[PDB]
Amino acid sequence: CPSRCTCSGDSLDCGGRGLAALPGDLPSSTRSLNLSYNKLSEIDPAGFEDLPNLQEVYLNNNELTAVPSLGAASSHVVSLFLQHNKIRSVEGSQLKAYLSLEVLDLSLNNITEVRNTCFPHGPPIKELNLAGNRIGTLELGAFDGLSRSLLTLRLSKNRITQLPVRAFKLPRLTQLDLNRNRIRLIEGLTFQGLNSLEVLKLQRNNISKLTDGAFWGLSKMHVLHLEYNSLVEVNSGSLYGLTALHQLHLSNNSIARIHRKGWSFCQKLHELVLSFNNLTRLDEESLAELSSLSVLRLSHNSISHIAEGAFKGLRSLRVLDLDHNEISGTIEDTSGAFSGLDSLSKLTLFGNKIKSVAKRAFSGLEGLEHLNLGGNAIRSVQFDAFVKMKNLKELHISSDSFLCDCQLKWLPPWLIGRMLQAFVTATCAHPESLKGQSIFSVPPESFVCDDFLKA
Ligand SMILES: *[C@@H]1O[C@H](CO)[C@@H](O[C@H]2O[C@H](CO)[C@@H](O)[C@H](O)[C@H]2NC(C)=O)[C@H](O)[C@H]1NC(C)=O
Ligand SMILES: *[C@@H]1O[C@H](CO)[C@@H](O)[C@H](O)[C@H]1NC(C)=O
Ligand SMILES: *[C@@H]1O[C@H](CO)[C@@H](O)[C@H](O)[C@H]1NC(C)=O
Numbered sequence: 458c459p460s461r462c463t464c465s466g467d468s469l470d471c472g473g474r475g476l477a478a479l480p481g482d483l484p485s486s487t488r489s490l491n492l493s494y495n496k497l498s499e500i501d502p503a504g505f506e507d508l509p510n511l512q513e514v515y516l517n518n519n520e521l522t523a524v525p526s527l528g529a530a531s532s533h534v535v536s537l538f539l540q541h542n543k544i545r546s547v548e549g550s551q552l553k554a555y556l557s558l559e560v561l562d563l564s565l566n567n568i569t570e571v572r573n574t575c576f577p578h579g580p581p582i583k584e585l586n587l588a589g590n591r592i593g594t595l596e597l598g599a600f601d602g603l604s605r606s607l608l609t610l611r612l613s614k615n616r617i618t619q620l621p622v623r624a625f626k627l628p629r630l631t632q633l634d635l636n637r638n639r640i641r642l643i644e645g646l647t648f649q650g651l652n653s654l655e656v657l658k659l660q661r662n663n664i665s666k667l668t669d670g671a672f673w674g675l676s677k678m679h680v681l682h683l684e685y686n687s688l689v690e691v692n693s694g695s696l697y698g699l700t701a702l703h704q705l706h707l708s709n710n711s712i713a714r715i716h717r718k719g720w721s722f723c724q725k726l727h728e729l730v731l732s733f734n735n736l737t738r739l740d741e742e743s744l745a746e747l748s749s750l751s752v753l754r755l756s757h758n759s760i761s762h763i764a765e766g767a768f769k770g771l772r773s774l775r776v777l778d779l780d781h782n783e784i785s786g787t788i789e790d791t792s793g794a795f796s797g798l799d800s801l802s803k804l805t806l807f808g809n810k811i812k813s814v815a816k817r818a819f820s821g822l823e824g825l826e827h828l829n830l831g832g833n834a835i836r837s838v839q840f841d842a843f844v845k846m847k848n849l850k851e852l853h854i855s856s857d858s859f860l861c862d863c864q865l866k867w868l869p870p871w872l873i874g875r876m877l878q879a880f881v882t883a884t885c886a887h888p889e890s891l892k893g894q895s896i897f898s899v900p901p902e903s904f905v906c907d908d909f910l911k912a
């Protein structure tokens with residue numbers, strides 16, 4: 458066993474020793490070899506006999522300028538970790554010898570380009586990680602040599618600008634990671650050739666336009682990440698072919714309206730996240746085709762108008778997030794905004810502009826167990842406003858704007874009797890003989906209006 462290195466079983470730890478050369482002097486039984494955090498500028502391939510057990514090799518955080526040759530031991534290496542070196546190019550002639558290579562980490566290097574010759578037919582790579590380089594050019598078919606084996610491909614934090622039609626022929630890839638690049642636009646059929654794809658990450662690009670058929674071919678995809686882009690809308694045609702889609706993440710875009718037609722193409726959707734956008738209204742049946750949808754997140758928009766039947770068709774919905782919008786009149790005057798939401802369990806309207814609560818506002822919310830009306834300056838609640846919600850077990854209220862007249866008299870004893878007083882902070886604004894006092898502190902007969910007609 459090496460002088461400065463440490464031997465525990467079949468693992469050999471030479472990491473953080475500060476070596477420029479390789480010790481070796483390498484035990485035949487060595488399976489794991491940690492050479493990371495040294496100052497290696499190169500590797501001498503003659504140092505790697507005899508090592509029939511060599512499977513894992515850690516060469517990250519060194520000064521390597523190319524992918525190295527492990528000599529006689531190359532063809533048995535299963536995982537090769539090369540991240541945080543100074544490698545500028547990947548040489549297919551050097552990867553040819555790695556006939557057992559399954560994991561290859563090339564992240565955080567100085568790679569600017571990938572050509573076809575970089576990844577030839579040879580090494581059966583399952584996971585290729587190229588994240589955090591400066592890749593700004595991909596030849597058409599760059600990874601196609603790895604098609605029979607490649608399952609995961611990470612291209613995060615590069616400088617990729619566009620993708621051609623039918624960019625990849627990688628029919629077994631299950632995850633493609635293209636986030637934090639510079640893609641502005643996805644053309645039609647860009648991702649055809651990715652039959653097995655399950656997860657596509659396209660967030661933190663500059664995507665302004667999804668072409669019709671942008672994602673056609675991705676019929677097995679379950680998750681699509683499009684957060685932090687520049688979409689002002691989601692065109693119906695752009696969703697065509699996403700039949701197996703379960704999660705759509707559109708947060709932190711600029712989406713100002715949603716079209717109904719597009720939801721027909723992903724009916725098996727389960728979670729839709731449209732939070733942090735610029736929506737102002739929700740129109741009738743605009744979501745009707747999403748009948749398997751379970752979770753809908755619409756918080757941090759500017760929604761002020763919710764049409765009657767806006768949520769019709771959503772028979773599967775369980776969680777509705779409408780926090781931090783501009784909602785007011787919906788809960789004050791409108792009836793039927795929530796019809797079709799019989800199955801709904803949780804609904805939150807925290808931090809809106811609601812001043813009063815009407816009985817008719819909650820038409821269609823009978824299954825509700827959780828209601829959040831906190832962060833609203835509510836002045837009054839109509840008598841038995843929550844009568845249809847027999848299953849309501851949690852009710853959040855936080856207002857110091859209450860008018861404590863005869864119209865509010867019913868609320869404290871009803872809340873206490875339903876075990877709903879725990880999450881209610883309710884303070885009286887008027888009358889002035891009751892200001893600042895808790896809704897529960899006020900004596901029952903102190904709640905009075907003007908009865909000018911002596912009855
Ligand atoms: C959308 O973007 C906003 C920022 O523009 C994200 O907000 C936050 O960032 C951290 C994550 O929770 C918090 O510590 C910050 O306080 C919070 N900032 C603001 C201004 O709210 C938000 O999480 C993003 N959401 C999604 C789904 O992408
Ligand atoms: C590898 O060596 C580095 C450098 O000291 C150390 O931080 C790390 O924990 C080691 N890991 C393994 C698996 O040996
Ligand atoms: C990164 O790669 C480029 C390619 O020419 C090179 O000029 C630059 O010096 C590299 N950076 C470092 C820190 O070596």
Ligand SMILES: *[C@@H]1O[C@H](CO)[C@@H](O)[C@H](O)[C@H]1NC(C)=O
Pocket residue numbers: 641663665
């Ligand atoms: C994204 O594209 C738009 C289109 O004009 C423009 O702001 C610029 O090219 C890009 N902006 C950023 C911040 O990358």
Ligand SMILES: *[C@@H]1O[C@H](CO)[C@@H](O)[C@H](O)[C@H]1NC(C)=O
Pocket residue numbers: 711734735757758759
């Ligand atoms: C989107 O809404 C945010 C606040 O909700 C606002 O600051 C921003 O200017 C809006 N953008 C557009 C393009 O309307």
Ligand SMILES: [Cl-]
Pocket residue numbers: 636660
């Ligand atoms: Cl991210």
